[PDB]
């Protein structure tokens, strides 16, 4: 399975599955700074799933590793901003993360395999 471009549609499909999940709702759009007025005192680089999807569709990811780094930032931001490890929003973030890690692993493996095959000779 040595298609170097296949990761892009596979990531589009996985983002569709995350957007169809209730646990994504706090992460679909940038954190509301009126709701959380100290957010940028804690978080240096905001990230959300609409920004990831727009970056993918603009053709501004070169690899699925770059998309994976941004999605992981969504989760690390939630962990850094949470006042408690028991908080609702953080709790939702950990379920999304396990689902994401479960499905992204084949996308990364297949892409890296395809690039090694391209450089085989
Ligand atoms: O659009 C969907 N299905 C399309 C299929 C043709 C029917 N979805 C998206 C969400 N689904 C998950 O698998 C899921 C489960 C747990 C978590 Cl945490 C997350 Cl993020 C996602 C199933 C329903």
Curated annotation (Swiss-Prot):
Phosphoserine modification, residue list: 1, 91
Domain Bromo: 2-107
Tissue and organ distribution: Expressed in myeloma and epidermoid carcinoma cell lines.
Location(s) in or outside the cell: Nucleus
List of residues that carry Phosphothreonine: 45
Function of the molecule: Probable regulator of the insulin and insulin-like growth factor signaling pathways. Stimulates cell proliferation through regulation of cyclin transcription and has an anti-apoptotic activity through AKT1 phosphorylation and activation. Plays a role in the regulation of cell morphology and cytoskeletal organization.
Subunit text: Interacts with IRS1 and IRS2. Interacts (via bromo domain) with acetylated lysine residues on histone H1.4, histone H3 and H4 (in vitro).
Disorder noted: Chung-Jansen syndrome: An autosomal dominant disorder characterized by developmental delay, intellectual disability, autistic features, anxiety, hypotonia, obesity, and dysmorphic features.
Protein name in UniProt: PH-interacting protein
Organism: Homo sapiens
């Amino acid at each position: 399975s040595y298609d170097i471009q296949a990761w892009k549609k596979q990531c589009e499909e996985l983002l569709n599955l995350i957007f169809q999940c209730e646990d994504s709702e706090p992460f679909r759009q940038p954190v509301d700074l009126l709701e959380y007025p100290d957010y940028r005192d804690i978080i240096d680089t905001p990230m959300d799933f609409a920004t990831v999807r727009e970056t993918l569709e603009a053709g501004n990811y070169e690899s699925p590793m770059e998309l994976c780094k941004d999605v992981r930032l969504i989760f690390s931001n939630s962990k850094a901003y949470t006042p408690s490890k028991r908080s609702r929003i953080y709790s939702m973030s950990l379920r999304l993360s396990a689902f994401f890690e479960e499905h992204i692993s084949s996308v990364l493996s297949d892409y890296k395999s395809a690039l090694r095959f391209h450089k085989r000779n």
